[PDB]
Enzyme design. Structure first.
Site, PDB file in Angstrom:
ATOM      1  N   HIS A  89       0.816  -1.210   0.000  1.00 21.63           N
ATOM      2  CA  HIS A  89       0.000   0.000   0.000  1.00 21.63           C
ATOM      3  C   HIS A  89       0.867   1.286   0.000  1.00 21.63           C
ATOM      4  O   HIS A  89       0.302   2.369  -0.085  1.00 21.63           O
ATOM      5  CB  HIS A  89      -1.101   0.002   1.056  1.00 21.63           C
ATOM      6  CG  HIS A  89      -0.641   0.226   2.454  1.00 21.63           C
ATOM      7  ND1 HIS A  89      -0.627  -0.804   3.367  1.00 21.63           N
ATOM      8  CD2 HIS A  89      -0.241   1.362   3.064  1.00 21.63           C
ATOM      9  CE1 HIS A  89      -0.194  -0.271   4.503  1.00 21.63           C
ATOM     10  NE2 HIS A  89       0.032   1.029   4.374  1.00 21.63           N
ATOM     11  N   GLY A 144       2.154   6.361   9.339  1.00 25.14           N
ATOM     12  CA  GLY A 144       3.583   6.399   9.051  1.00 25.14           C
ATOM     13  C   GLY A 144       4.342   5.208   9.620  1.00 25.14           C
ATOM     14  O   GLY A 144       5.497   4.973   9.244  1.00 25.14           O
ATOM     15  N   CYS A 184       3.523   2.016   9.235  1.00 23.21           N
ATOM     16  CA  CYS A 184       3.460   0.839   8.378  1.00 23.21           C
ATOM     17  C   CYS A 184       4.827   0.424   7.869  1.00 23.21           C
ATOM     18  O   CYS A 184       5.700   1.260   7.665  1.00 23.21           O
ATOM     19  CB  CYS A 184       2.457   1.041   7.253  1.00 23.21           C
ATOM     20  SG  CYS A 184       0.789   1.421   7.840  1.00 23.21           S
TER      21      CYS A 184
HETATM   22  C1  LIG Z   1      -3.656   5.206  10.048  1.00 24.92           C
HETATM   23  C2  LIG Z   1      -2.876   4.015  10.545  1.00 24.92           C
HETATM   24  C3  LIG Z   1      -2.426   3.963  11.861  1.00 24.92           C
HETATM   25  C4  LIG Z   1      -1.713   2.863  12.294  1.00 24.92           C
HETATM   26  N1  LIG Z   1      -1.436   1.810  11.522  1.00 24.92           N
HETATM   27  C5  LIG Z   1      -1.861   1.848  10.255  1.00 24.92           C
HETATM   28  C6  LIG Z   1      -2.572   2.922   9.713  1.00 24.92           C
HETATM   29  N2  LIG Z   1      -2.953   2.946   8.350  1.00 24.92           N
HETATM   30  C7  LIG Z   1      -3.836   2.125   7.734  1.00 24.92           C
HETATM   31  O1  LIG Z   1      -4.521   1.285   8.311  1.00 24.92           O
HETATM   32  C8  LIG Z   1      -3.984   2.350   6.233  1.00 24.92           C
HETATM   33  C9  LIG Z   1      -2.843   1.746   5.445  1.00 24.92           C
HETATM   34  O2  LIG Z   1      -5.178   1.712   5.748  1.00 24.92           O
HETATM   35  C10 LIG Z   1      -6.270   2.499   5.696  1.00 24.92           C
HETATM   36  F1  LIG Z   1      -6.315   2.958   4.440  1.00 24.92           F
HETATM   37  F2  LIG Z   1      -7.282   1.646   5.971  1.00 24.92           F
END
Ligand SMILES: Cc1ccncc1NC(=O)[C@@H](C)OC(F)F
Ligand SMILES: Cc1ccncc1NC(=O)[C@@H](C)OC(F)F
Lengths: 304, 304
Positions: B41, B143, B145
């Site tokens: 992603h 951030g 990820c």
């Molecule tokens: C914000 C955040 C905070 C912590 N971990 C991951 C994310 N991020 C996501 O889940 C993104 C990749 O997906 C979303 F589009 F559903």
């Protein structure tokens, strides 16, 4: 999303860990520049610890009696000196992995990470707090002495703790990197009882703010209190008295959440008086006091 | 003395963290040998996440569109490929800090350390468990990820997790290093509800053994039970059923303490039925399930 008991990345400290052996005793050392710092009780046998005269025991030791090994290579000791309860072993090689560093003496209520080591090798990292009675609740077995506590601000490691002792009650005591013990503890195998382990109020409030930020809000109530009123309750529950300095330090969390510090104090007051009623906050069933307000801001913002 | 939620020393993993940017999205990558692994992603904009066609989005990307930076130096991307939900970016330089490593797919109930990172920079390390519903309860902001989960056996890092998603419920989902999600989660911003978060019974029992070893013994009782009897109680409390494989894995802790596994199961049964009655075990007011029996042995012995 989520709030965890997080330790600092330990890489910068792992690069400083060495093994120090004197006679039959082996513990950990911290190699920074051309000096290796370790507890002075490395010169003691288990029987010496009952009543050691460190100055007298040190006279019988020469540079060649301190075996310092960094990984698989031996360091040459060219000088040794005792500073309070630490030994400083001057070696002929500066540690090439020496990070930017400072030695700080922390206040009770402040948190830090510990890199637990055995034989100069790291076993794990955890976050803990200097208790108001100057003990730490760690995880240290025999051989872990010389393991250090630290904080990291971007690229600078501030070393604040060096492990020395396990009290007969299972709690831990140690020194700052100048060799001065935190609290009244001494490096002797004798009766050393810790004082009251009071709860760090400002840290519990910081953690309640972290819970609100992460969605756990059930404990928010319709009440407020004053510092003097809150402090009457805090005294009853062995909580540290809250001061205006603590209120000021919570200012950024109060601003971000829109919850006045005294309103949060009133939530805390009700939690102390009524308990959690089988409920949890940030996965805990008790009030957590090992996150400072700075820790909460750092974690909730993503500081690296 | 003492028992802590300990993470592995993170140095070996810190040396692998890089920043990956594609278009306007920046996340973390894991640089091992001449390959950088990151969530696919990274090619998505926040709007693409609603319904992404990764194969179609990837066609519009060339090697030069993936900006990989390790500290302050740029890595040259000479190849790219998608494997399940991860991208593999072939770079022209092998990471000189590559530790000995393996990619493992862990089972639910297994624990691991996470090195939370932002922009390729480590912010902290914490220990967590793969929940029985294949989620993890982490601390991840936007951030983070590409941050990874791992275990370390002496000098070998076994990478088991890569962070991808935050579910609308605040829990986390991700993949192994082959890009396969744990559980039924997908890398799409859609309704993805987690299943029942059951308690990892074998880990709670391992932690009760750790408590006995460290002095917390109040919960030991005069009773015993059978696997089938214990399991009736476990079902009632959303605990995972205990099997003879779990009993066998607890064998070393049972041998060290002299407390039969079924006697400990009976202590656990009474704790489930009666609660803690305002008391604590290893500083916790609830039953901890994020220590495996291997973790308890490791910590209680001093494995480095
Ligand atoms: C914000 C955040 C905070 C912590 N971990 C991951 C994310 N991020 C996501 O889940 C993104 C990749 O997906 C979303 F589009 F559903
Ligand atoms: C056993 C142990 C376990 C964990 N930490 C430290 C120690 N060791 C000590 O306290 C020694 C240095 O003093 C003792 F002589 F009183």
């Amino acid at each position: 999303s989520g709030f965890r008991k997080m330790a600092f990345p330990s890489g910068k400290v792992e690069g400083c860990m060495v093994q120090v052996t004197c006679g039959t005793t082996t513990l950990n050392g911290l190699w920074l520049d051309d000096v290796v710092y370790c507890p002075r009780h490395v010169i003691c046998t288990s029987e010496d610890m009952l009543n050691p005269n460190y100055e007298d025991l040190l006279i019988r030791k020469s540079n060649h009696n301190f075996l310092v090994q960094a990984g698989n290579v031996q360091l040459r000791v060219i000088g040794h000196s005792m500073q309070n309860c630490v030994l400083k072993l001057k070696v002929d090689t500066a540690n090439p992995k020496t990070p930017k560093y400072k030695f700080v003496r922390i206040q009770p209520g402040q948190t830090f990470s510990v890199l637990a080591c055995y034989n100069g090798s790291p076993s794990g990292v955890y976050q803990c707090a200097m208790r108001p009675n100057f003990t730490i609740k760690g995880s240290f077995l025999n051989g872990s002495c010389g393991s250090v506590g630290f904080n990291i601000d971007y690229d600078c490691v501030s070393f604040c703790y060096m492990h020395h002792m396990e009290l007969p009650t299972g709690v831990h005591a140690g020194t700052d990197l100048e060799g001065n013990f935190y609290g009244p503890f001494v490096d002797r195998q004798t009766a050393q009882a810790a004082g009251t382990d009071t709860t760090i109020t400002v840290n519990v409030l910081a953690w309640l703010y972290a819970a609100v930020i992460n969605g756990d809000r059930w404990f928010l109530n319709r009440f407020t209190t004053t510092l003097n009123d809150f402090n009457l309750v805090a005294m009853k529950y062995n909580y540290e008295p809250l001061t205006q300095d603590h209120v000021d330090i919570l200012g950024p969390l109060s601003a971000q959440t829109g919850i006045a510090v005294l309103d949060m104090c009133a939530s805390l007051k009700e939690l102390l008086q009524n308990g959690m009623n089988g409920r949890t906050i940030l996965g805990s069933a008790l009030l957590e006091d090992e996150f400072t307000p700075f820790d909460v801001v750092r974690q909730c913002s993503g500081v690296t």
